[PDB]
Amino acid sequence: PQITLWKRPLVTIKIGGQLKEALLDTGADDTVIEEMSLPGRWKPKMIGGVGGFIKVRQYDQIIIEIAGHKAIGTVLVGPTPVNIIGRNLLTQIGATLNF
Ligand X SMILES: COc1ccc(S(=O)(=O)N(CC(C)C)C[C@@H](O)[C@H](Cc2ccccc2)NC(=O)O[C@H]2CO[C@H]3O[C@@H]4OCC[C@@H]4[C@H]32)cc1
Which residues are identified as catalytic? 25
Separation CA 11–CA 21 (nearest Å): 6
Going by their DSSP bridges, the two strands 18-24 and 84-85 should be labelled as: parallel
Pick the piece of the chain touching ligand X (CB under 6 A) from 12-20, 46-54, 60-68, 90-98. 46-54
Q: Is 7 within 8 Å of 16 (Cβ atoms)?
A: no
Q: At its nearest, how many Å lie between ligand X and the CB of residue 82?
A: 4
Using rule CB under 5 A, residue 40 touches Na ion: yes
Q: Pick one of ligand X, Cl ion, its own copies, none as the site partner of residue 93 (Cβ within 5 to 8 A by kind).
A: its own copies
